[PDB]
């Protein structure tokens, strides 16, 4: 509805992520693996699940690709601004958001088919006793798909990454005010102001996702301990699989987006520093 994330990881490469759709498809991705991993007889089914999820991605991409003309128009506008059409950028950005909301039910149909797939697997979940259900599927899944991600994030220190990004925005904010106060008679002063304004907003979205990753890492790590060397009653076993698939989905969404936004923040700072190399060269050649 209003939970879209714009991402420019490379030069002239814009894309979007409908936050709720990402979490939803990811939740059912985890439900699927958890159901097939529970018993060894069904592990091999992951081949089919991987194939189906590829069909879901290819189908969803076909819907996103309808809004490609509007997206490529906004890419062309942003390209010109990275050299006054700031008002034209806002109207082309609103235009992209509009056709995304237009294809709302085309995306919903894909999401719903994904819910059905994972739910069918979830519904066929044997338990030899039903009063003692093996938590094997929970660990085999956790260990392969989720555990590794917990450790990469634990090592990263995402708060220092955020602190280093504020310093970048503060340096640019000071250079921007020193140019305005001292020598405002410069070319590309508006493009610096635009890039810094865009990078300030990217930072806030990274700041949001890192907050989620931080507590979700603690939650997942605490929860998994309790659903791992036990034997739940089928009803309770299924409840945990859903609960875990939920925690995994919120974590993977915010983690995936934070990394994508991180690349766009530093891609925009690369183009920003290209202009700073011009500004130092100009000031140096003038100083001759």
């Amino acid at each position, epitope marked *: 509805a209003n939970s879209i994330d714009i991402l420019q990881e490379k030069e002239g490469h814009l894309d979007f992520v409908i936050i709720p759709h990402y979490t939803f498809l990811d939740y059912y991705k985890h439900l699927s693996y958890n159901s097939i991993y529970h018993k060894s007889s069904t592990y091999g*089914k992951y081949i*089919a699940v991987d*194939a*189906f999820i590829k*069909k*879901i991605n290819e*189908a969803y991409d076909k819907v996103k690709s309808k809004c490609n003309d509007i997206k490529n128009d906004l890419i062309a506008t942003i390209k010109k601004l990275e050299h006054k059409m700031m008002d034209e950028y806002n109207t082309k950005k609103k235009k992209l958001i509009k056709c995304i909301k237009n294809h709302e039910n085309d995306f919903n*149909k*894909i999401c*719903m*088919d*994904m*819910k*059905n*797939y994972g*739910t*069918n697997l979830f*519904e066929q979940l044997s338990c030899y006793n039903n009063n003692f259900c093996n938590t094997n599927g929970i660990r085999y899944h956790y260990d392969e798909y989720i555990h590794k991600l917990i450790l990469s994030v634990k090592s990263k220190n995402l708060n220092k990454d955020l602190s280093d990004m504020t310093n970048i925005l503060q340096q640019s904010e000071l250079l921007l005010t020193n140019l305005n106060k001292k020598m405002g008679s410069y070319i590309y002063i508006d493009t610096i102001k635009f890039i810094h304004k865009e990078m300030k907003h990217i930072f806030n979205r990274i700041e949001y996702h890192t907050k989620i990753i931080n507590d979700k890492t603690k939650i997942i790590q605490d929860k998994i301990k309790l659903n791992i060397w036990r034997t739940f009653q089928k009803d309770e076993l299924l409840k945990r699989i859903l609960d875990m698939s939920n925690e995994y989905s919120l974590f993977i969404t915010s983690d995936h987006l934070r990394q994508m936004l991180y690349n766009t923040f530093y891609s925009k700072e690369k183009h920003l520093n290209n202009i700073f190399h011009h500004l130092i060269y100009v000031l140096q050649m003038k100083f001759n």
Partner: single-chain antibody
Amino acid sequence: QVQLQESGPGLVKPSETLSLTCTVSGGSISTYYWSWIRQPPGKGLEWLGYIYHSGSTDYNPSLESRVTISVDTSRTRFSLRLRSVTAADTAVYYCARSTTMIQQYFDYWGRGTLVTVIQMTQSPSSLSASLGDRVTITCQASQGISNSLNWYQQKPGKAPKVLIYDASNLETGVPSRFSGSGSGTDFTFTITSLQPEDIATYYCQQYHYLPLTFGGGTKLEIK
């Protein structure tokens, strides 16, 4: 296990509305695809339409808008209403279920009740081979289908049952002697070695373009 059971009039006077209901037992309806497929005596299969997701519907234009599929989810039943019947509508009505449209195939089929009032060209309509022989059937679509092709085995008297989905992939229990192959327009089903448990009529199906169509079938018998 999930089970579908159709219950209807079995005899409808011409131009009246045919009303059969299906009762989903041992499972919920929820957002699955609940279709009604009919089979005229001695003829092939026709998908009439389905109800899916939050009560959305899609019907076969051949039905001429006189078809309506509805669901009282609370009842856990879905039902068919076919207005202005003709002796054309004399058929065995199967109530069936697919899970998606992304990778559509029929998971469960009811017992089928007799009610008496893209071009999938399946190549060997009949075939009589000895046991052990390799039998190989062909299905050709009127246009591009990608690998959106399924194959069913309809045992004598029984409802059709999925053997291959997405042109080549076998369903979990189906024996390896069955082989799906093909993409785009030309598809081929092949039993590498004929078994006594194989005397059935096999049908192909497409799901690429919305009016879901079946093939002519191959009535396989022993010589």
